[PDB]
Amino acid sequence: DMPVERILEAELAVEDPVTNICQAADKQLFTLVEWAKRIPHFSELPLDDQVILLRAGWNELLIASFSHRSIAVKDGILLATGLHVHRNSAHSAGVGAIFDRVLTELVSKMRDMQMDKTELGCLRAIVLFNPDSKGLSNPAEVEALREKVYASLEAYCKHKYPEQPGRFAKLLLRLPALRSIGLKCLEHLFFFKLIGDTPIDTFLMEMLEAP
Amino acid sequence: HKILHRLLQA
Ligand SMILES: Cc1cc2c(cc1-c1cc(/C=C/C(=O)O)ccc1O)C(C)(C)CCC2(C)C
């Protein structure tokens, strides 16, 4: 069983500019672990698989969260630290292109369709249960959990938004953009680490370790 | 991955 109520509960339970953005990511990594612990059946996976799933998914998971948080704001993102980063600020720091991808492909789209917190929660839980993550002891169990999430998300969408039969697919079809943006963000992060001019705290640094 | 393991334990 995979109740959307429990997924939304997990969401509500956890509620230069580049330096500020990196501090925010580190902060949210601690909170992400608590979020995942509240997603049904995650804690029952082998500890090594929980580690694999979180190491695989943390960036997409956290990007989805700050993007949805930012729907109330125009041309900016809202960090968990209470700081706002304006598009102009991101551009002036040399990271404008990737910032605009976040605004256009994620925030604006989430805004336009009025994606709700249950829907966000379920998309994130799908990202979490990524059965393609390398090294999983039982990929089939993770696949089964993902299937349970999207079965529950679709049922929710049909009941809450019956006037929008394409809504469930539209939610799922933000995932390629999320994947691409997560990968580009990670590339920047590795560069920041390489040049060494940007402080990176311990948990974010740990996530940048090789496996 | 020491921080992650610690946090997952409890
Ligand atoms: C760490 C990080 C870096 C960046 C970005 C985001 C993050 C980032 C922030 C967070 C912050 C989350 C939060 O505050 O809730 C989480 C994961 C991340 O990868 C955006 C996408 C804004 C574009 C520019 C760069 C500086 C590459």
Description of the structure:
Chain A is an all-alpha fold. Chain A has one domain: Retinoid X Receptor (Orthogonal Bundle). Helix content of chain A is 68%, strand content 3%. Chain A contains ten helices and two strands; from the N terminus they run H-H-H-E-E-H-H-H-H-H-H-H. In chain A, strands 1-2 form a two-stranded antiparallel ribbon. In chain A, helix 5 packs antiparallel against helix 9. The longest helix of chain A has 23 residues. Chain A is globular and about 45 Å long. Chain B has 10 residues and is mainly alpha-helical. Chain B is elongated and about 15 Å long. Classes of the chains: A mainly alpha (211), B mainly alpha (10). The complex binds the ligand Cc1cc2c(cc1-c1cc(/C=C/C(=O)O)ccc1O)C(C)(C)CCC2(C)C. The site of the ligand Cc1cc2c(cc1-c1cc(/C=C/C(=O)O)ccc1O)C(C)(C)CCC2(C)C has 21 residues of chain A, from helix 2, helix 3, helix 5 and helix 9.
